[PDB]
Amino acid sequence: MRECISIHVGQAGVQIGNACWELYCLEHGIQPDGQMPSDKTIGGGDDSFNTFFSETGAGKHVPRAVFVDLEPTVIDEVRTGTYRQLFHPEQLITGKEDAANNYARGHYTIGKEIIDLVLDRIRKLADQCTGLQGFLVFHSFGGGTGSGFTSLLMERLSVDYGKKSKLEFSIYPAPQVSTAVVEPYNSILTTHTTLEHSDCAFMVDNEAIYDICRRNLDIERPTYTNLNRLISQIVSSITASLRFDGALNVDLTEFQTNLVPYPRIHFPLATYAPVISAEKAYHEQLSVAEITNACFEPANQMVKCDPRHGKYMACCLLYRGDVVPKDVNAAIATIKTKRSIQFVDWCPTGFKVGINYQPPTVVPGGDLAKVQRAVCMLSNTTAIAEAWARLDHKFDLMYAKRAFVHWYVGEGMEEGEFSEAREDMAALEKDYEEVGV
Amino acid sequence: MREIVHIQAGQCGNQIGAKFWEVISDEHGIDPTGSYHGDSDLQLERINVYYNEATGNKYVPRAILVDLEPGTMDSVRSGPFGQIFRPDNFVFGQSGAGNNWAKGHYTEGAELVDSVLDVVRKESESCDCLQGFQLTHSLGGGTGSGMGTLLISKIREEYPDRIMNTFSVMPSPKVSDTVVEPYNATLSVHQLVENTDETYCIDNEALYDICFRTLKLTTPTYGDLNHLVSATMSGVTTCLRFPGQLNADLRKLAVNMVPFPRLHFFMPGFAPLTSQYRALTVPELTQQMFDSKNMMAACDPRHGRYLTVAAIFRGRMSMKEVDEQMLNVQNKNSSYFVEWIPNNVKTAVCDIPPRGLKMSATFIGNSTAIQELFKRISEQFTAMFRRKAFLHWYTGEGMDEMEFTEAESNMNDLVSEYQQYQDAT
Amino acid sequence: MYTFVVRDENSSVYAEVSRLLLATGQWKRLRKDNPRFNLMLGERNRLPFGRLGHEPGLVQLVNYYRGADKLCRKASLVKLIKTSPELSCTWFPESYVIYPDEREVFLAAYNGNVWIAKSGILISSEASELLDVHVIQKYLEKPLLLEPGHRKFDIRSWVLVDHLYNIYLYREGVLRTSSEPYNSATCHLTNHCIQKENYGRYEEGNEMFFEEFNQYLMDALNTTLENSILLQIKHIIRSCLMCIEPAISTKHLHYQSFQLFGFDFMVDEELKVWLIEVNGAPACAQKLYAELCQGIVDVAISSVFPLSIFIKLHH
Amino acid sequence: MEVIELNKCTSGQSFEVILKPPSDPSLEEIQKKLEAAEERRKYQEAELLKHLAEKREHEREV
């Protein structure tokens, strides 16, 4: 067994981290006090769930998690939350004043004063690991801490854990829930500085999750609680192979091997189905073919884009529930003849499939209905570059006038880092177009 | 970022600052004696932003009252909420400033400024995480204008990493005390351009027009004008005083509203305008909130473009309908929002409405049309300065004509800077 | 009040559409770079489809189908017909893609033997002169020749596909005729540019419309335009668009697309219709601009943003 | 259409379906960047205090 350490940075990362670990506890049968009766090896063990949980002498199962936020309000709710006993104080790190939606303030000014503390608290967990795989970093693009402090942390992790893998779960900025005008700036800056240090990054556009909640859950004005419960379902589908017995994506390295043929293009598109409202009295349970076909509808993707006008480099189907290989192949055969699925000439046109018989777990009192079978498709398509174009275009509009730039220079940053980061994004868009056309 | 230190200087600053504390003390369930008698924990969740907690669980405003004569401050101490203020935070002189920027900034105010900074320091030392300072003052007088900007400069020297915010009342011949007001205002604007992060331009011309044209007040008094100011001050600070995600602290507000450091002068707006029993609909709030007749600065928004906008809806309403109506204004009037700042309109919602109203909306706009205000002051300034009229009041306090020429040039530069981004594409 | 932007100043068709939209008092034109638009009359090259449908509170529509170039490019059309099982093909001339591929396959068919190469055109009987990206297509050596004149022609049909992928064929077509008699060994290329440079003898501007051409087929051949030609045209239009429908449809997309196409057909002496090419940004006939551009607003624009001359090709 | 590498267990199973074959900076360098930006802050703050100090001198001369 090899351990994984989760790192939650900023408000978005922390609150999403809370939803995930809550979902992890329900799936593994861990109670809010960290006690799991199902575990018979009291005080230790090398089971599959031990990748995300350590065990104490009293039988408490403690997440291998570190929460970080440059201000205390959000993490304080974890200190007094339902799962307060789950964590111990050393895992929760808070400052007093935040980055004010300013990348330079989270990376240079305030980040320099707390980076050593966080690395030290991460070193505490790494010492409890017989064989650490790497890290799962949760953060936003638009926040000053999520963008600024994450880039600095990812730089230092490559120094202290050069052989370990690092996966991201990134929240892409959407004006419908946005809190700052300069989020395009922070997104480009943190992507440029974190690119070479990230092995595989799963982007989640708040726009897509917002509309999925409105369309498929009948929520007029979705809240962060609505968005995060749905995001945690996708994150759980992606990490279930690390927490349960299986043979597909059993360690963080397989994610890079199965989904990332070229390092810079490490942004797989995630698509999830079915999303059913719990308020709905009854719902006709969808078949294997129906949910697999839904993986090719843009309305179910984590980023709104058109994979038909790009090319695939890899595809992974992750089923949970009553699914057998026979139904999957019959669904893939039907879909090949209808959908427009183009692979790059230097990749096999195929799918890696993983099935876990335990159906998806829904938080009681949530908005998602229980389903007998669900799927999450991870496909590395060049169409996701549409999100980089949207982001870079907004960056170009503001930076041409140097709007808000003085806020970053005032924190010690140089204007040159803006154009340096934008030029790296211009190359990234070019890499996608070479592969996709 | 939790504590804000309030400062009110001069006649206008203290009469307006006093009404501000009366309004928000009612919204936070604090009585004139500082005791809490509210019915919602949302009132006390962010009470430490503007109040200190005393011994017997009393709440003392974190406010400092400044003036060069005791006249107005004695009226505050005798006012309804006068007992709530910390007695030691009353710092006042005797000689007065005679509506003279020089007296407040260089002579009379210099004698008193160190005493004020001692009270500021005493209040800042007990702050867990000081956001910065907010100042209420006029620009047309002497104390609030001259000593006010002196305080801002000396506070920035001692707290250069804190946010400086002001509510600045702009003079107008319609509500004018002396003819030297354009002098005092031009000199102060230059100071504000350099040493503040956020300035709400409250124009006495607009307040009078609103009282006369809209509220049908034949003879508006300063009390009638201050009802509009108190209501606007409550709205623009709602996001600071109640739990929320958008513009919840002074620095994040500055990052969202100030694309260029010198262009930090905001046009406030409020709806509905009061001096009624029918509650307004969300479409009505949005239309009036953006109407020129609701702007507290006498500028036509259609003559300029919006760099950034902050909107605050208060009360119990459909947050979906709020999102819809806000998108409607932007999509129907896209030309008046600069296209080179995407998504420059941010909206917040608070469930607690102000007193007397079930629904309210507050507008905070950074429009290039604010240049019309500075143009107006500059024309009044130059009309007298081309003949050196009334300058002896200032040269007698040690000032040189060169300092006036510099202030005139600096404000004309500010006007040109606003015009740059009004035609920028 | 709806909003739209214009990003193709050279579009004679949509210059009239934007003129008609403003004339209704319910459409406001924004700056070309204003993102808060309902309709986009986009450019021909590098249209930013990825930035569409991301404006909350704005139903956005664009006058181009992303991916339609597969049908409106010479080499792409050949590749599409040969590789698509639903097209396999009796109505498309035998063609081959040649780079300066299927060259050895083109010579196998070479062993009537007159061809044509295009992408500057070259018609030759010997293949060596042709080879000395392009597509080599079989030249129709026996075209239907109009009389009096003994001359060549081609038919242009305008097709409108709306956001629901309804296929609308404009009633009025046009025959871009040659004014010179066809010689087997200017009379071969019926382009309006090549003919305008004996022009305008039989019909005005070498443009014969359907009323005159239908009367000719009745008097000269004892048949109608509908039966002899139009049935094959509607079949070809439907087959081409229904083939690419799964790849370009915006049915479940965050933005909607429509597009006006220009199909160019050739008729042989046996009254058989052949497809020549499909144009993605076509122009209209002068006397037909008014009726067609109004039909675009009613069927493609006003259907999405509310305020017959078409034949609906049902699926 | 081939199905390969079928692994089964009690929790589930996995496999691969093919439809067609194919045709860092050091800690020192980081600390330099962080401290180089910190010095640009101190410089800008010192230029401000220098500017404010010149204003204090003007207040005396008046």
Ligand SMILES: Nc1nc2c(ncn2[C@@H]2O[C@H](COP(=O)(O)OP(=O)(O)OP(=O)(O)O)[C@@H](O)[C@H]2O)c(=O)[nH]1
């Ligand atoms: N999905 C989701 N997005 C969030 C959540 N919280 C914040 N965001 C998004 O993240 C962006 C803002 O960044 P934050 O994470 O809130 O800021 P931060 O990391 O705390 O950094 P600071 O600027 O120092 O406060 C916006 O685009 C928000 O919409 C959340 O709980 N769930």
Ligand SMILES: Nc1ncnc2c1ncn2[C@@H]1O[C@H](COP(=O)(O)OP(=O)(O)CP(=O)(O)O)[C@@H](O)[C@H]1O
């Ligand atoms: N296989 C073929 N057989 C007979 N004639 C042909 C032919 N291919 C082309 N032609 C003739 O050459 C002319 C030009 O062909 P083509 O349409 O490919 O060029 P083009 O695209 O520049 C004109 P447009 O864009 O208006 O259709 C046609 O009108 C036709 O008369």
Ligand SMILES: Nc1nc2c(ncn2[C@@H]2O[C@H](COP(=O)(O)OP(=O)(O)O)[C@@H](O)[C@H]2O)c(=O)[nH]1
């Ligand atoms: N709105 C408002 N404006 C005032 C009030 N008192 C004075 N002013 C304005 O402020 C200017 C005079 O400044 P004032 O505050 O009286 O001088 P100071 O005491 O030396 O600061 C004039 O332009 C007045 O119109 C008031 O109570 N309300």
Ligand SMILES: [Ca+2]
């Ligand atoms: Ca165990």
Ligand SMILES: [Ca+2]
């Ligand atoms: Ca004295």
Ligand SMILES: [Ca+2]
């Ligand atoms: Ca002292």
Ligand SMILES: [Mg+2]
């Ligand atoms: Mg935060």
Ligand SMILES: [Mg+2]
């Ligand atoms: Mg006075």
Ligand SMILES: [Mg+2]
């Ligand atoms: Mg053509």
